[PDB]
Amino acid sequence: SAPPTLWSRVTKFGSGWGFWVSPTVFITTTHVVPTGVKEFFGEPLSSIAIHQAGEFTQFRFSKKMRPDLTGMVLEEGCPEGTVCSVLIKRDSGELLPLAVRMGAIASMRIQGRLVHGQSGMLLLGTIPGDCGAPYVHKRGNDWVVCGVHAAATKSGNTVVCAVQ
Amino acid sequence: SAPPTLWSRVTKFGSGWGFWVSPTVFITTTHVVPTGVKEFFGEPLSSIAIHQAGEFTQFRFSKKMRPDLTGMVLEEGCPEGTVCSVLIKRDSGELLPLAVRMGAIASMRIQGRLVHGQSGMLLLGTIPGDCGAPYVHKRGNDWVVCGVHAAATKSGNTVVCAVQ
Numbered sequence A, B: 001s002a003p004p005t006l007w008s009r010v011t012k013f014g015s016g017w018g019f020w021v022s023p024t025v026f027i028t029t030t031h032v033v034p035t036g037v038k039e040f041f042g043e044p045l046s047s048i049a050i051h052q053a054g055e056f057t058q059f060r061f062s063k064k065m066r067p068d069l070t071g072m073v074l075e076e077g078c079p080e081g082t083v084c085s086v087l088i089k090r091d092s093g094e095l096l097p098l099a100v101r102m103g104a105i106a107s108m109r110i111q112g113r114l115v116h117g118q119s120g121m122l123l124l125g126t127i128p129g130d131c132g133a134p135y136v137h138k139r140g141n142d143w144v145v146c147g148v149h150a151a152a153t154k155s156g157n158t159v160v161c162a163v164q
């Protein structure tokens, strides 16, 4: 089970969620980012370092936004067969950790866009507001984040996280 | 260390917090409850059974609001000497559990009103926005909630939870 502090990194953002990797680094999927705004979390966009590609968006703020957190390891996906937890927060406050057996890392075309992602099989599914939720796993003594929720098939049995 | 599901019961409400004891029962303190609203969590006030006893307020909703939750043990305070955790969330999303060594249950005047509460000694103090946070402890294998945060002395050393 993921520690409470790890869940506390999952933050409402735009039309979904994002995740604090460190006091200054926030990750989410590109579709949930709000547009037509001049600030994120009260910080002007010109003050934020941004890397956005393949449906993965990373922000690095110029001040400590979550000084309570330790910077954790972000990896580009995980080994095939890893069982990740998708840390889904629902608007009720429910915490819904979904177990996913991860498959291949690949570039895919989803609704006409290039996603650099990893597919996995859900072990009762994700919904539109869940985009941005982190995929995490425990390696030895440390938690690792390796993607953010981006898509699922119509049946709902398969999910895709964007990776960086 | 409280599990994530226990933290997920801590819910922003009014000027502070409240706590889901069960899918239908929500507790908070009287001073946190907002006036001039027509709804709580989308439910009209007239559809909720609201019980106020001194500084303790409980809502019983007529629909399942948190059907993910099991109903837990709500006790009228705890044994003297128990070290509780007060499950405080701060505005950033930071989790700030505070340890409190509990003292006596009593009827005490706080700002002119006789409150049924349990005092304790904090072991980085509490702030106005923390009212309604739950006082919890683990008894054997089960977590127990025994009050909600209501007050603190000017010095900050003594806290009071309202009990029912």
Ligand SMILES: CCOC(=O)CC[C@H](C[C@@H]1CCNC1=O)NC(=O)[C@@H](CC(=O)[C@@H](NC(=O)c1cc(C)on1)C(C)C)Cc1ccc(F)cc1
Binding pocket: A015, A031, A032, A055, A109, A110, A111, A112, A113, A114, A115, A126, A127, A128, A129, A130, A131, A150, A151, A152, A153, A154, A158, A159, A160
């Ligand atoms: C701002 C709008 O976007 C959002 O709402 C983000 C939240 C939802 C979450 C989905 C929503 C439902 N269940 C879920 O888990 N995501 C999407 O809708 C994505 C599309 C799908 O999930 C589709 N899946 C595939 O095409 C698909 C193909 C494969 C493989 O896996 N999924 C449909 C389920 C809509 C949006 C998207 C489009 C192009 C991309 F580059 C990347 C993403």
Ligand SMILES: CCOC(=O)CC[C@H](C[C@@H]1CCNC1=O)NC(=O)[C@@H](CC(=O)[C@@H](NC(=O)c1cc(C)on1)C(C)C)Cc1ccc(F)cc1
Binding pocket: B016, B031, B032, B055, B108, B109, B110, B111, B112, B113, B114, B115, B126, B127, B128, B129, B130, B131, B150, B151, B152, B153, B154, B158, B159, B160
């Ligand atoms: C609208 C106000 O609502 C709120 O903000 C609720 C949150 C704060 C949290 C305090 C705020 C600061 N640090 C804290 O932890 N609570 C209070 O302010 C309470 C008053 C006190 O804390 C006072 N304490 C005592 O009198 C007192 C006596 C003993 C014993 O312990 N505390 C003062 C700290 C203001 C409000 C109250 C009044 C009459 C009652 F029936 C019962 C409660």
